[model samples]
Target: GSSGSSGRDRSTIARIQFRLPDGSSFTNQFPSDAPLEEARQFAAQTVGNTYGNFSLATMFPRREFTREDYKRRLLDLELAPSASVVLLPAGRPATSIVHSSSGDILMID
Candidate 1:
């Protein structure tokens, strides 16, 4: 008799590399089912900058992941077995823009 399950879970292990603003980097292996927030926390802890506000962005595609993305499985995001990403400080809110007669300027946080 065969089990009902069609296949084994392939996301149990994933390797990720994170680059910081200071040009330093770290790589770790984590369960893909673990929340992405765990990776974020790891990066902060490694850099000893727990107070800083930052987010993880996949390097190849160059996109920032939102809070909702943190709750999902890392494998669901189509991350490769060995992916590379960057830890970037959260950018200013889109609302922090000023419209002037000349043009629009963004306010840095």
Candidate 2:
């Protein structure tokens, strides 16, 4: 019998694992509609670090995400109900470079 619905069930929450570069990780659940940045901030707090100092990426495909990507919702990203992600330390931008009168440039971390 065709119930005639799209027959798709969407989850309201996403269970995700945040893996650190040292091979340690933690798991948590977040609302699917929450912005990706929320998860990144949570991960940073959990690890006693500041937000914006790290980057989050999916484990399987292993692609780095930019700050703008954080504006998207988890569901819109088509992530599985349960996802595994890795958190990598973010690099300082070139704007942090310092130049001395001696013509030497140094990058400040």
Candidate 3:
């Protein structure tokens, strides 16, 4: 007997774990079709403002979640059953540079 049914075995909810760098995590369930941004909003909201400038990323896949990821649903990311997402603080690291080109000097002929 092979495990096959053509359908009816997928989970309707996704068990997600918002893992923190502090060895803590916030676990919750959401509809499979829920957008990744939904989880993102809750992740920090639940953790208070202390979680500012964070990135939502998966652990196994080992990649960062970009704005595009927000458009994808939970189930699409294989988060239906369960998945661990690590919170990378300022993952992209933004640096401010006061770019000022040297004053252009024109020949005063």
Candidate whose lDDT is highest: 3
Task: Give the range of the ten consecutive residues with the poorest summed lDDT in model 2.
Answer: 1-10
Better of 2 and 3 by TM-score: 3
Candidate 1 — worst ten consecutive residues by lDDT sum? Answer: 1-10
Report lDDT (Cα) of residue 46, candidate 3: 74
How well does model 1 score by local distance difference test? 0.67
Identify the runs in model 1 with alpha carbons over 4 angstroms from their true place: 1-11, 90-109
Badly placed stretches (over 4 Å) of model 3 are 1-11, 91-109
Model 2 CA deviation exceeding 4 Å by range: 1-11, 50-52, 90-109
Return whichever of 1 and 3 wins on TM-score: 3
Error of 2 at 46 (Å): 0.7
The candidate, 1 or 3, that scores higher on lDDT is 3
lDDT of each: 0.67, 0.66, 0.73
Angstrom error at residue 14, model 2: 0.6
Evaluated against the true structure, the overall lDDT of model 3 is 0.73
Instruction: Report the C-alpha displacement of residue 84, candidate 3, in angstroms.
Output: 1.0
- How do all the candidates rank in terms of lDDT, highest first? 3, 1, 2
lDDT of 3 by residue, 3-82 (tens): 21122234578888989988878898877778777787788667655646677888888988766677777788778788
Model 1 residue 22 CA deviation in Å:
1.7
lDDT of candidate 1 over 43-71, digit per residue (tens): 86676544265677988888878767676
